[PDB]
Ligand binder design. Structure first.
Ligand SMILES: CCCCCCCCCCCCCCCCCC(=O)OC[C@H](COP(=O)([O-])OCC(O)COP(=O)([O-])OC[C@@H](COC(=O)CCCCCCCCCCCCCCCCC)OC(=O)CCCCCCCCCCCCCCCCC)OC(=O)CCCCCCCCCCCCCCCCC
Ligand SMILES: CCCCCCCCCCCCCCCCC[C@@H](O)O[C@H](CO[C@H](O)CCCCCCCCCCCCCCC)COP(=O)(O)OCC[N+](C)(C)C
Ligand SMILES: CCCCCCCC/C=C\CCCCCCCC(=O)OC[C@H](COP(=O)(O)OCCN)OC(=O)CCCCCCC/C=C\CCCCCCCC
Ligand SMILES: CCCCCCCC/C=C\CCCCCCCC(=O)O[C@H](COC(=O)CCCCCCC/C=C/CCCCCCCC)COP(=O)(O)OCCN
Ligand SMILES: CCCCCCCCCCCC(=O)SCCNC(=O)CCNC(=O)[C@H](O)C(C)(C)COP(=O)(O)O
Lengths: 459, 175, 178, 124, 63, 88, 219, 55, 70, 104, 84, 128
């Protein structure tokens, strides 16, 4: 597992020793090579795991997330190349350094064979992203966004630390293998109820759970494009990964402690979906769509069935790719109009047809159109929920409706109709932006052919 | 085909009627099949002959892996991590093989339904019965375990089932 | 569409609009040309006896009552011309209307074809550039104090002058660009 | 239908419920009761795999109709005697159902007449 | 000339590949291609066995 | 489509053709520049019926605000030319 | 539930079509009523008859939109039937094809629509079902005949009602051949298909004479 | 129409999705066809993008 | 692909004899098909078997007894 | 926004707005792609009464038709082999009670 | 290559109310003391090939004559061929 | 005498049926003149910025900025706890949660009682 960690660290001296006009090229090329190395990890086995050492281990749940994390960095560099053109060389190197450090912490978090190391890296990721948001952000609200994104997170995560050390004092280990093998049931007690809450709330905040999601629209809207891509694609999935890992010590308590959360999701995924219907900002609409999809993932993890887990893994990968693509499209529009108001720039299919087809494919994947992996995750979670209770279908069913609706709304408001007359600076799409779009969307339609790669360890 | 075992996937002897034309009017289906044979099957057959002789020019073999039997979770100490590890791996392999057995029986059922045509409700009672048996056994073994299933949880489920069975047998005997 | 609207409608304008609506909806009702022509002449006459009504209170009670009558017998599915706002091809060709400034972003290889067009286009741009400086001054000197009162634009009054704010009226894409 | 008019406006008990016929024993009329006959056996009728709703007393004619249709394929009007035979047999079956309905109705009428006449005698 | 070449590149080539894909790869595994068994009527003979299904019960033929 | 590219001459000919079939105006008097209110002694209702006749002739509908101030056949022809964009 | 849904759908869509002024709207409501008839057929447990109706309706309804679009294009993008006058002679081939399609739609005997719609009415009459759904099916058949009459009469029989500059033109080989292929379909396909498929339901062999004639009488 | 090649491509896409719907043996394949015909109907109804009523 | 047809402006449009003969031919074929099918298959609308009468059937046929049997 | 004047020359012809005019709080509710409040030939309440009345009537009559089904004066179909016992479910090792049909 | 043949407008004095239902409209209108100023604007709808109308049943019977003749010839040929 | 048209929220009153436009008064005329004057000033400013050949960007609209700012960023500083706000927030944010909780809890309790009784017929229910 060091064969990926060491090159990612070596990305830093190479960036800092590069010529002033060769940083982007070297970073992109080397990062892409690292992503290629990540593919070897996928050849997972039906038995336990790839236990590389005492420190790191890989799994068919961790491998798709690792591959997506390594793949996301070249795209973030491509998206950041544009708006950082008038920026000093040292600060551009600092930005690339923040991205590399973020990737380094993320890669490490997944192998993270023990829960304390996982917690440390899980919280280490909070620093580079906060710096990215509060330094390279445009609006004046970014500061508030940063503060929210910080304290919410820590408010959920400091109790977890306590719980974690408590467990190591009772069981004697926090290694995930020993925890899984020596698992014991949780008795119905008040102390056990509060240990369950301390274990769950940290990951439930970062999903985010409906009601605890106020940080997300801010931190996504006022972040730069690379920050938004990494926040939606990977950082939201840390909560899901942690929930999938830690619920092995929470049975049979979860059988009824999950009721308040399931409700908050099953109703919440409706509410936020309806919020997308009345939105004056593209980034805010995409953020709320992220909230709805992660609400479905929360339901899947709380049900705790093999189909729920397969659907949740598939949906996490699919949502990461789709939401990154949507944010990149919105940013392509923004860098021309400088407004980020959805109603302002209209009729863009007439001026940018290839951007229009990119928008269509992104909306169709957000639509959960078969046989995309978005549909695969959606359907597995819906079937599992139906088995859990036949009434969930109503909520699930209606959610699908609203999703499609607002998705096509986003396509019709910005691409169709009549172009705005007074806007005359809509220059043709660059090769960089079209390449970014293709490099988002082709992996999705390539993953739809080999679903077992992203269906998790219960496949 | 010698590629798969007929006994595992049984097939009826496939009785077909013989062509008994009643009118001298020449049907189009037979002419169409002869021209299809001449224009499609012969080139495909020739290409397959070439490909098969090239494959025969280079023959090499691969082996199906053999797994020894290992003591299972019942004869394992409470905290003995190595024996739990091996018993868990063996249990997982057995779970996968059981899934494949259920898959085989389901393929049998589907093939019977398609083959028997309109009389499937009567001519596929055997496959339905064997699938019902296998489904009951599989549901008893592996249902309700959850996402974090293990050999210990399967053993606990089996233990409560056999406790209920022992209670029922004792009650019926002393009734 | 072209003419600037007024602050209100006078009595004659409202009467004429009612006359048009009534005739169009009657045509939508009685379809055949002879039937329509007969009932349209009857509509003209029944519209006509109060032509000379002098005092305005009776004339306003009249045409208000008529307005109510129109709503009742209008024909909830009236005929609409295909290119009219409710028509079946109202905005059919609106997606083919590309602005002229997009031509500035063409590649030089694209501009290699069509050289005469782009020469004439550059001539047009020069004309616009000079006319704009003249027209700002003209429209500033003619506008009444306190800002314009109506949406009306003065014409060009000198020899080489062009009407103020003409670039986006004459450079319309087309009615059917394709 | 007029039978609906009689049942749903007049006396319901005077006319049958179509769901539950017959309400009377087959031997109530006469003791001969010649049994119905099938020509199509189990095995060949199963092998023809007609349909579950087509596996009725007219099965033999349908078997021959399909056999002749298969045999004389291109000239797809060569089978008119066979289709007429099957269609007439189904006509006979429907007419026998008509007769079953009408026999049940008259049996019901006599039964009602018998009880009232008996009741009148009892009252006398 | 146009129709003859077109019927080669758009009809002949795809049917060649599909016939090869079905005959030598798909039917190599069991139950991939399943056909409803042909109907049997009284009086047919079978290629594999050679026997003849016994005729029917000679119902009273009239009209 | 397969529609002819109508020109100014055609528009003028058709406008005058429709006007001549308006019996309330004598055909031998009307001209391209003849005003309706004065030169032909027409009512406002006659003018609006004339606008209807032009609309039904040309297949499209002139809005009220633009129609109510069209007083010459040349003026109508020029408005139709502006709408259909027939420079020649 | 399926039977009731189909009955109310076919009735309501025929009732809406009976008074429309857009030709495409009328033909769309005709499609909706025929779909309602298909699900009525589903409700009386005759799936194969519904499939055969699907196949026949394909031919004649597609060719009916064919003719409608031919009229619209020849009339310079005019879709309202109030500006469609004497086209019986102006467009002879569109007229003959539309008449054939309308007769096929209304179940003219021994045509494409006969071999499906006729038996559908036959079977819905001879089955244990709702009385009200049967009534709505018959009324929907009558209304089908009625709006077919509406289109033919009001767009082909009167005096011309379209603008003076006449651009009527049928003489395009693409249009003519595309129409006539579906014409041959709408004339002979029902007979051919009905005589080539094996029997897969019991027929309604014997029936009251008035009930056998009900579809023709209602049309 | 300037985009007639696209129009033809769209019609072909609909035919392919409908054939997938008709020939489908399981429910997932039938859903693929089910949603394909729906999306292509959305794309062909709103053929003239600039018309609000089409959208 | 077709022929040249010019506008008329308030007159009947020109008609090629080809379209007239083709329309007339197809209408004639439709009516010939209707008449031919009606001639050779007349029962398809009329029916081939008479509808029996319930009143006509005898009591003995229906095995009905007027309170004599029991 | 649908009932604004379609003939005025707006700065935004599709949305029918002018640059600088105050925007309604619910503009995105009223965009000609969504809910419109244009006056209708019939009053709202009359339409509601009529629509509800038609639907209620059809429901009532469908239930009534369920109460009063329609059929032909016939008996049930007769199926030969013990009401087709073996070809519908099977179980050939139970020897079911034989049922025989009456010929007439 | 399009339809550019320099089409000319017909004579405007061609159109007359006589012999058309516009005459009946005129009679009914003058019975109440009025006149239609646009009668001749529409006369072209009753003048040329638009003068003759076809009934609905006449429209439905568009090719009945030749169909009937072909049916008679075919049935006669079948009658002659079968009786042999 | 004809039936009267009764307006509603989603079917408003037609302009030609508004008695206000027939109650003609002089202050109405001055109001209309002032409104059209404001509109003409705005149109003049927009067209002056719109036809300028030097401009190569977006004509910023303060009305659009005000709309979006009011819709998003002006809400909380103008919020006040009132009986209406408190009751509506409590209802719309709590009631659906407890309603769905009761529904799902009842459904699952019924299912569990049936399963413990064994009378549910879970035959072939393999994958969950
Ligand atoms: C369907 C069968 C196809 C068989 C042929 C092979 C198809 C290869 C497809 C490749 C993948 C899509 C590529 C996307 C980028 C395109 C970039 C581009 O502009 O192209 C330039 C080129 C020329 O464009 P241009 O003139 O330069 O630009 C004009 C403007 O851009 C203006 O552009 P435009 O207006 O022309 O828009 C482009 C066009 C097409 O462009 C796209 O939208 C592409 C993406 C569409 C899907 C969006 C994602 C939804 C999830 C679907 C997941 C499917 C994955 C399949 C495998 C993908 C592997 C990469 O728009 C659409 O057609 C929308 C299609 C909606 C599809 C609905 C049905 C989808 C499911 C179909 C079933 C598949 C499984 C079946 C299983 C059982 C039966 C096999 O245009 C194309 O080549 C278009 C390709 C045709 C569309 C294919 C859509 C169906 C195929 C889906 C994937 C392959 C399925 C294979 C199995 C089929 C059975
Ligand atoms: C705002 C967006 C979301 C934020 C987070 C919301 C999610 C957190 C909600 C916590 C989940 C449940 C908490 C406790 C669950 C225990 C089960 C209890 O609810 O049911 C009854 C519990 O009884 C009563 O409810 C006692 C508790 C009453 C007082 C506690 C306050 C409850 C609501 C407060 C919620 C406040 C949320 C925010 C706080 C910061 C059963 O009674 P009983 O069977 O006899 O005892 C069982 C427990 N034993 C066995 C350990 C003894
Ligand atoms: C359940 C659905 C719950 C309600 C969904 C609300 C959706 C709101 C968001 C939609 C976006 C806005 C919108 O769609 O605009 C309205 C839009 C455009 O209106 P036009 O008539 O086309 O106007 C054209 C001329 N201007 O119209 C719509 O599409 C809205 C349609 C909403 C339908 C709601 C009614 C559905 C009720 C179904 C009940 C019956 C079920 C069937 C029975 C099945 C039995 C087996
Ligand atoms: C996103 C913002 C959320 C803010 C934080 C929410 C998480 C709250 C979870 C509880 C916090 C503390 C949990 C303790 C960590 C686990 C350790 C543990 O389980 O030990 C318990 C100790 O249990 C406790 O001490 C729990 C006391 C909690 C004190 C802090 C209260 C926090 C808020 C209370 C009300 C709401 C709680 C959940 C709110 C959810 C978020 C809104 C029993 O051990 P012993 O005592 O040794 O064994 C019993 C025999 N002596
Ligand atoms: C089926 C459709 C519904 C039918 C019902 C509609 C009923 C409406 C008819 C009622 C009659 C009225 O107009 S109500 C009478 C209202 N008041 C007046 O008519 C006063 C003076 N009229 C004018 O000045 C006009 O402008 C005029 C002179 C005509 C032209 O002017 P020009 O000199 O500038 O052409």
């Amino acid at each position: 597992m060091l064969k990926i960690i060491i090159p990612t660290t070596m990305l830093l001296p190479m960036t800092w020793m590069s010529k002033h006009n060769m940083i982007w090229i070297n970073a992109t090329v080397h990062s892409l090579l690292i992503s290629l190395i990540s593919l070897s990890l996928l050849n997972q086995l039906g038995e336990n795991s790839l236990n590389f050492s005492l420190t790191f281990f890989s799994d068919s749940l961790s491998a798709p997330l690792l591959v997506l994390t390594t793949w996301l960095l070249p795209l973030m560099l491509m998206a950041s190349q544009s708006h950082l053109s008038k920026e000093t060389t040292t600060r551009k190197k600092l930005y690339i350094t923040m991205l590399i450090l973020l990737q380094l912490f993320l890669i490490m978090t997944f192998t993270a064979t023990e829960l304390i190391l996982f917690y440390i890296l899980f919280e280490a990721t909070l620093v580079p992203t906060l710096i990215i948001i509060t330094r390279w952000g445009n609006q004046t609200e970014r500061l508030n966004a940063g503060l929210y994104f910080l304290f919410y997170t820590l408010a959920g995560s400091l109790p977890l630390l306590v719980a974690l050390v408590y467990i190591q004092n009772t069981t004697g280990s926090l290694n995930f293998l020993i925890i899984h093998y020596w698992s014991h049931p949780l008795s119905n007690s008040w102390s056990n109820i509060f240990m369950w809450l301390a274990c769950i709330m940290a990951f439930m905040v970062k999903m985010p759970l409906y009601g605890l999601h106020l940080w997300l629209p801010k931190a996504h809207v006022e972040a730069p494009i690379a920050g938004s891509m990494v926040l939606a694609a990977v950082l939201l999935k840390l909560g899901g990964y942690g929930m999938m890992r830690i619920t092995t010590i929470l049975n049979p308590l979860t059988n009824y402690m999950a009721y308040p959360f399931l409700m908050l999701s099953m109703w919440g995924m409706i509410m936020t979906s309806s919020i997308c219907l009345r939105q004056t900002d593209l980034k805010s609409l995409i953020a709320y769509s992220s909230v709805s999809h992660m609400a479905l993932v929360i339901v899947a993890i709380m049900i705790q069935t093999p189909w729920s887990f397969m659907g949740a893994t598939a949906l996490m990968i699919a949502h990461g790719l789709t939401s990154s693509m949507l944010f990149c499209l919105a940013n392509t529009n923004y860098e021309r109009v400088h407004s980020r108001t959805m109603i302002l720039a209209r009729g863009l299919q007439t001026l940018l047809p290839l951007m229009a087809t990119w928008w269509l494919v992104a909306s169709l994947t957000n639509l959960a159109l078969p046989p995309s992996i978005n549909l695969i995750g959606e359907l597995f979670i819906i079937t599992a929920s139906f088995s859990w209770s036949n009434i969930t279908i109503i909520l699930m069913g209606m959610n699908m409706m609203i999703t499609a609706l607002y998705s096509l709304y986003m396509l019709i408001t910005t691409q169709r109709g009549k172009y705005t007359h007074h806007i005359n600076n809509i220059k043709p799409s660059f090769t960089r932006e079209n390449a970014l779009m293709a490099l988002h969307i082709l992996p999705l339609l390539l993953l739809t052919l080999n679903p077992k790669m992203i269906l998790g360890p219960l496949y | 085909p010698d590629s798969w075992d007929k006994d595992v996937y049984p097939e009826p002897p496939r009785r077909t009627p013989a062509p008994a034309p009643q009118t001298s009017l020449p049907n189009p289906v037979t002419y169409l099949t002869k021209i299809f044979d001449l224009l499609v099957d012969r080139p495909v057959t020739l290409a397959r002959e070439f490909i098969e002789q090239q494959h025969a020019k280079n023959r090499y073999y691969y082996y199906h892996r053999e797994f020894r039997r290992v003591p299972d979770i019942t004869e394992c100490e409470e905290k003995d991590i190595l024996c739990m590890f091996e018993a868990e791996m063996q249990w997982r392999r057995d779970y996968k093989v059981d899934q494949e057995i259920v898959n085989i029986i389901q393929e049998r059922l589907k093939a019977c339904q398609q083959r028997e045509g309109e009389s499937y409700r009567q001519n596929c009672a055997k496959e339905l019965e064997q699938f019902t048996q296998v489904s009951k056994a599989f549901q008893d073994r592996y249902s309700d375990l959850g996402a974090h299933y293990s050999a210990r949880k399967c053993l606990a489920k089996q233990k409560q089932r056999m406790l209920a069975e022992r209670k029922a047998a004792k009650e019926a005997a002393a009734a | 569409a072209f003419s600037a609207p007024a602050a209100y409608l006078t009595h004659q304008q409202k009467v004429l609009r009612l006359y048009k609506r009534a005739l169009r909806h009657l045509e939508s009702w009685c379809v055949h040309r002879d039937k329509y022509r007969y009932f349209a002449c009857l509509m003209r006459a029944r519209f006509d006896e109060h032509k000379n009504e002098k005092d305005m209170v009776k004339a306003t009670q009249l045409l208000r009552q008529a307005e109510e009558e129109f709503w009742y017998g209008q024909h909830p599915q009236p005929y609409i011309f295909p290119e009219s706002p409710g028509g079946t091809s109202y905005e059919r060709y609106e997606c083919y209307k590309v602005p002229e400034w997009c031509l500035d972003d063409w590649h030089p290889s694209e501009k290699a074809m069509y050289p005469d067009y782009f020469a004439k286009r550059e001539q047009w741009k020069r004309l616009r550039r000079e006319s704009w400086e003249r027209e700002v001054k003209q429209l500033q000197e003619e506008t009444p104090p306190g800002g314009p009162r109506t949406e009306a634009l003065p014409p060009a009054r000198k020899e080489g002058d062009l009407p103020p704010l003409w670039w986006h009226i004459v450079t319309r894409p087309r009615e059917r660009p394709m | 239908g007029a039978h609906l008019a009689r049942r749903y406006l007049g006396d319901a008990s005077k006319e049958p419920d179509p769901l539950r016929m017959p309400t009377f024993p087959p031997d109530y009329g006469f003791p001969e009761r010649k049994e119905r006959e099938m020509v199509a056996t189990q095995q060949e009728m199963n092998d023809a795999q007609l349909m579950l709703q087509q596996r009725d007393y007219c099965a033999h004619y349908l078997i021959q109709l399909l056999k002749c249709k298969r045999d004389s394929f291109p000239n797809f009007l060569a089978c008119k005697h066979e289709q007429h035979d099957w269609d007439y047999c189904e006509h006979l079956d429907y007419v026998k159902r008509m007769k079953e309905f009408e026999r049940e109705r008259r049996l019901l009428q006599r039964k009602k007449r018998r009880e009232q006449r008996e009741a009148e005698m009892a009252r006398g | 000339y146009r129709h003859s070449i077109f019927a080669v590149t758009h009809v002949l080539i795809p049917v060649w590949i599909i016939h090869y894909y079905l005959k030598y790869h798909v039917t190599a595994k069991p139950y991939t291609v399943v056909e409803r068994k042909p109907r049997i009527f009284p009086g047919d003979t079978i290629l594999e066995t050679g026997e003849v299904i016994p005729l029917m019960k000679e119902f009273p033929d009239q009209h | 489509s397969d529609a002819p590219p109508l020109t100014l001459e055609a528009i003028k000919d058709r406008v005058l053709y429709v006007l001549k079939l308006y019996d309330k105006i004598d055909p031998e008097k009307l001209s391209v520049n003849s005003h309706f209110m004065k030169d032909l002694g027409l009512d406002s209702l006659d003018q609006v019926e004339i606008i209807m006749a032009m609309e039904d002739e040309f297949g499209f509908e002139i809005p009220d605000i633009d129609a109510e101030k069209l007083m010459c056949p040349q003026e109508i022809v020029d408005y139709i030319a502006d709408k259909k964009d027939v420079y020649e | 539930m399926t039977l009731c849904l189909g009955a109310i759908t076919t009735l309501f869509t025929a009732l809406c079509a009976i008074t429309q002024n857009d030709i495409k709207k009328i033909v769309a409501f005709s499609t909706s009523s025929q779909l309602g008839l298909m699900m009525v057929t589903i409700g009386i447990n005759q799936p194969h008859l519904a499939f055969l109706h699907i196949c026949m309706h394909a031919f004649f309804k597609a060719m009916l939109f064919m003719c409608s679009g031919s009229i619209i294009h020849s009339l310079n993008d005019e879709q309202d039937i109030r500006k469609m006058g004497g086209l019986y002679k102006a467009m002879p081939f569109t007229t003959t094809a539309l008449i054939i399609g309308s007769l096929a739609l209304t179940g003219m005997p021994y045509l494409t629509g006969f071999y499906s719609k006729d038996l559908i009415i036959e079977a819905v009459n001879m089955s244990y079902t709702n009385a009200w759904a049967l009534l709505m099916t018959l009324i929907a058949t009558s209304l089908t005949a009625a709006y077919s009459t509406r289109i033919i009469f009001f767009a082909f029989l009167g005096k011309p009602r379209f603008p003076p500059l006449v651009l009527i033109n049928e003489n395009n080989p693409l249009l003519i051949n595309s129409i006539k292929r579906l014409l041959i379909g709408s004339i002979f396909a029902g007979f051919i298909i009905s005589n080539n498929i094996p029997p897969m339901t019991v027929p309604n062999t014997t029936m009251p004479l008035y009930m056998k004639m009900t579809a023709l009488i209602v049309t | 129409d300037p985009f007639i090649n696209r129009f033809f491509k769209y019609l072909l896409l609909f035919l392919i999705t409908m054939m997938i719907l008709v020939t489908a043996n399981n429910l997932f394949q039938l859903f693929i066809g089910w949603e394909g015909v729906g999306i292509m109907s959305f794309l062909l109804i709103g053929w003239w993008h600039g018309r609000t009523d089409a959208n | 692909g077709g022929v040249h047809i010019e506008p008329r402006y308030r007159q009947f449009p020109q008609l090629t004899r080809s379209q007239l003969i083709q329309a007339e031919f197809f209408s004639a074929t439709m009516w010939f098909w209707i008449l031919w099918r009606f001639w050779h298959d007349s029962d398809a609308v009329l029916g081939h078997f008479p509808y029996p009468d319930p009143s006509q059937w005898t009591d003995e046929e229906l095995g009905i007894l007027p309170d004599d049997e029991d | 926004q649908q009932e604004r004047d379609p003939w005025y020359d707006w700065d935004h012809p599709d949305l029918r707005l002018n640059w600088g005019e105050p925007i309604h709080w619910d503009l995105d509710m009223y965009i000609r792609n969504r809910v419109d409040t244009s006056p209708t030939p019939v009053s709202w309440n009359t339409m509601c009464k009529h629509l509800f009345g038609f639907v209620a009537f059809m429901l009532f009559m469908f239930w009534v038709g369920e109460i009063y089904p329609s059929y032909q004066p016939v008996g049930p179909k007769q199926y030969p082999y013990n009401d087709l016992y073996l070809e519908r479910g099977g179980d050939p090792t139970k020897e079911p009670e034989p049922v025989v049909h009456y010929e007439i | 290559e399009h339809g550019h043949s320099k089409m000319e407008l017909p004579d405007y004095k061609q159109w007359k109310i006589e012999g058309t239902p516009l005459e009946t409209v005129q009679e009914k209108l003058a019975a109440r003391g009025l006149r239609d100023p646009w009668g001749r604007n529409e006369a072209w709808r009753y003048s040329g090939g638009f003068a003759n109308n076809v009934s609905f049943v006449g429209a439905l019977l568009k090719g009945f004559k030749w169909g009937f003749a072909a049916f008679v010839v075919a049935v006669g040929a079948e009658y002659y061929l079968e009786s042999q | 005498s004809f039936p009267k048209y009764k307006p509603s929220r989603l079917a408003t009153l037609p302009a030609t049926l508004d008695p206000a436009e027939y109650d003609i008064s002089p202050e109405t005329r001055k109001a209309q003149a002032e409104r059209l004057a404001i509109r003409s000033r705005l149109k003049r400013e927009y067209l002056l910025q719109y036809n300028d050949p030097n401009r190569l960007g977006v004509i910023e609209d303060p009305a659009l900025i005000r709309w979006t700012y009011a819709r998003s960023a002006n809400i909380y500083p103008n919020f006040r706890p009132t009986p209406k706000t408190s009751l509506l927030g409590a209802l719309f944010g709590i009631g659906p949660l407890f309603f769905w909780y009761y529904v799902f809890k009842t459904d699952r309790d019924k299912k569990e009682k049936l399963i413990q009784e064994g009378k549910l017929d879970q035959t072939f229910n393999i994958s969950y």
